[PDB]
Enzyme design. Sequence first.
Site, short mmCIF file in Angstrom:
data_model
loop_
_atom_site.label_atom_id
_atom_site.label_comp_id
_atom_site.label_asym_id
_atom_site.label_seq_id
_atom_site.Cartn_x
_atom_site.Cartn_y
_atom_site.Cartn_z
N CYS A 1 0.85 -1.19 0.00
CA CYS A 1 0.00 0.00 0.00
C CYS A 1 0.88 1.22 0.00
CB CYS A 1 -0.92 0.05 1.23
SG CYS A 1 -1.98 -1.36 1.41
N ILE A 2 0.39 2.29 -0.61
CA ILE A 2 1.10 3.55 -0.62
C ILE A 2 0.09 4.67 -0.38
CG2 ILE A 2 1.02 3.55 -3.17
CD1 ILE A 2 3.50 5.27 -3.19
N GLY B 1 4.11 11.57 -3.69
CA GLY B 1 3.70 10.24 -4.10
C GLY B 1 4.62 9.73 -5.20
N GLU C 1 0.92 -3.88 -5.62
CA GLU C 1 -0.15 -4.84 -5.43
C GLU C 1 -1.48 -4.29 -5.91
OE1 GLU C 1 -0.52 -6.16 -1.46
OE2 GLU C 1 -2.34 -7.34 -1.81
C1 LIG Z 1 -0.81 -0.03 -4.26
C2 LIG Z 1 -1.71 0.99 -3.61
O1 LIG Z 1 -1.40 1.49 -2.59
S1 LIG Z 1 -3.21 1.43 -4.34
C3 LIG Z 1 -3.84 2.84 -3.45
C4 LIG Z 1 -2.93 4.09 -3.68
N1 LIG Z 1 -2.91 4.85 -2.46
C5 LIG Z 1 -4.03 5.67 -2.12
O2 LIG Z 1 -5.01 5.73 -2.86
C6 LIG Z 1 -4.01 6.46 -0.81
C7 LIG Z 1 -4.81 7.83 -1.02
N2 LIG Z 1 -4.22 8.52 -2.15
C8 LIG Z 1 -2.88 9.11 -2.02
O3 LIG Z 1 -2.30 9.03 -0.95
C9 LIG Z 1 -2.26 9.85 -3.21
O4 LIG Z 1 -3.31 10.33 -4.05
C10 LIG Z 1 -1.31 8.99 -4.02
C11 LIG Z 1 -0.32 8.20 -3.12
C12 LIG Z 1 -2.10 8.01 -4.86
C13 LIG Z 1 -0.50 9.93 -4.94
O5 LIG Z 1 0.28 10.81 -4.14
P1 LIG Z 1 0.42 12.36 -4.59
O6 LIG Z 1 1.51 13.08 -3.75
O7 LIG Z 1 -0.87 13.07 -4.38
O8 LIG Z 1 0.80 12.34 -6.17
P2 LIG Z 1 1.80 13.33 -6.97
O9 LIG Z 1 1.81 14.70 -6.41
O10 LIG Z 1 3.22 12.79 -6.92
O11 LIG Z 1 1.31 13.37 -8.48
C14 LIG Z 1 1.53 12.20 -9.26
C15 LIG Z 1 0.78 12.19 -10.53
O12 LIG Z 1 -0.43 11.72 -10.36
C16 LIG Z 1 -1.41 12.83 -10.82
N3 LIG Z 1 -2.33 12.98 -9.89
C17 LIG Z 1 -2.16 12.79 -8.57
N4 LIG Z 1 -3.35 13.05 -7.97
C18 LIG Z 1 -4.24 13.42 -8.94
C19 LIG Z 1 -5.59 13.79 -8.87
N5 LIG Z 1 -6.71 14.00 -7.96
N6 LIG Z 1 -6.25 14.10 -9.98
C20 LIG Z 1 -5.60 14.05 -11.21
N7 LIG Z 1 -4.29 13.69 -11.29
C21 LIG Z 1 -3.61 13.37 -10.14
C22 LIG Z 1 -0.54 14.10 -10.89
O13 LIG Z 1 -1.10 15.01 -11.88
C23 LIG Z 1 0.65 13.65 -11.24
O14 LIG Z 1 0.72 13.46 -12.68
P3 LIG Z 1 1.51 14.49 -13.57
O15 LIG Z 1 2.99 14.52 -13.20
O16 LIG Z 1 1.37 14.08 -15.04
O17 LIG Z 1 0.89 15.88 -13.34
#
Ligand SMILES: CC(=O)SCCNC(=O)CCNC(=O)[C@H](O)C(C)(C)COP(=O)(O)OP(=O)(O)OC[C@H]1O[C@@H](n2cnc3c(N)ncnc32)[C@H](O)[C@@H]1OP(=O)(O)O
Length: 268
Positions: free
Chosen positions: A140-141, A153, A174
Site C-alpha cells: 500500500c502507498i 507520491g 499490489e
Molecule cells: C498499491 C496501492 O497502494 S493502491 C492505493 C494508492 N494509495 C491511495 O489511494 C491512498 C490515497 N491517495 C494518495 O495518498 C495519493 O493520491 C497517491 C499516493 C495516490 C498519490 O500521491 P500524490 O503526492 O498526491 O501524487 P503526486 O503529487 O506525486 O502526483 C503524481 C501524478 O499523479 C497525478 N495525480 C495525482 N493526484 C491526482 C488527482 N486528484 N487528480 C488528477 N491527477 C492526479 C498528478 O497530476 C501527477 O501526474 P503528472 O505529473 O502528469 O501531473
Amino acid sequence: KYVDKIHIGNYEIDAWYFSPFPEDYGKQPKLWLCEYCLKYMKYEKSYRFHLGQCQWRQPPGKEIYRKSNISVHEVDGKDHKIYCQNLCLLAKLFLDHKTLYFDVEPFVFYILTEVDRQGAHIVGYFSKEKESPDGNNVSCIMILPPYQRRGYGRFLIAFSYELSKLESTVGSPEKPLSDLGKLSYRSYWSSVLLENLRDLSIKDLSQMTSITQNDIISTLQSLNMVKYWKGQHVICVTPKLVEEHLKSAQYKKPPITVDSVCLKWAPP
Ligand SMILES: CC(=O)SCCNC(=O)CCNC(=O)[C@H](O)C(C)(C)COP(=O)(O)OP(=O)(O)OC[C@H]1O[C@@H](n2cnc3c(N)ncnc32)[C@H](O)[C@@H]1OP(=O)(O)O
Ligand code: NA
Ligand code: NA
Ligand code: NA
Ligand SMILES: [Zn+2]
C-alpha cells in the site's frame, strides 16, 4: 459510528474510509494522533498531555534516506509493532482496499517525513511484504491529503523502484490500485520510460527500471508506442515522438528526485 476526522500535527483531516480503530476510539468523533509516535487518543486533553511527555521527534527504525530536509525511515513490522499498527489504522482512513492493520509483522514500512527544527513530520508511507509471492514491490502507498499533489507520491513510487533495482528484481504495486494510485503509477511509468527512450527492447527497459514488462507494455500501449507483430510486443517509437510527449504540459519535471547517493540501503 466511525472515526470521521483526525487531528495530527497542525492538521485536521476528514476521513475518506472506514478504519477499524477500537469501538470506543472508533466511536469517538475525532481522534487525536501524535504525529511522531502515531499514538491515537480520544480527547484534546489527553492529546495535549501526551505532546508534553512524548519524547519521539521522528519515526522509529533506521533513516535510510536523507537529502536536504526529506527523510525516509525503514521500519520492520516485527520490531516496531505498535507503531506500524497505528500507521496502518491511519492509512486505512484513506485507503479503500487495505485489509491488514494489526498483522504487521510480515511487512516493512517506509515512512516519508519533512524535517524542520522541531522534528521529522510524517508525510506518507508505503508498505512492502518481506516475502511477496506476486512480486509486489509495494503493498500500500499513501500520502496524507494535505501533502498530496506535490510530488511526494511520485517520490515514494520512485523510491520503491530504487529498492527493486538494488534487489536486482522487477516489481509492481499490489492490485487493485485506487484510481489515484493508477493515475500516479501511469504518470510515473510514462515519464521513466519516455526519458529512457530519449537518452532498447522491452526486456531491456524492464531490466533498467525494474518495471515489469506487463506494466511497460500497458504504458507503451497508452502512448501508442508499441506494435504487435504475430504475438510479440515490439517497441515502435521515433526519437521525435518521444520528445513530443516529454515536452508537452503532460509531463512535468519539477519533482523531488531519489538521489541514490543519499540512499543507505543494502538488499534483504
Ligand atoms: C498499491 C496501492 O497502494 S493502491 C492505493 C494508492 N494509495 C491511495 O489511494 C491512498 C490515497 N491517495 C494518495 O495518498 C495519493 O493520491 C497517491 C499516493 C495516490 C498519490 O500521491 P500524490 O503526492 O498526491 O501524487 P503526486 O503529487 O506525486 O502526483 C503524481 C501524478 O499523479 C497525478 N495525480 C495525482 N493526484 C491526482 C488527482 N486528484 N487528480 C488528477 N491527477 C492526479 C498528478 O497530476 C501527477 O501526474 P503528472 O505529473 O502528469 O501531473
Ligand atoms: Na480534509
Ligand atoms: Na480529507
Ligand atoms: Na475534507
Ligand atoms: Zn507520541
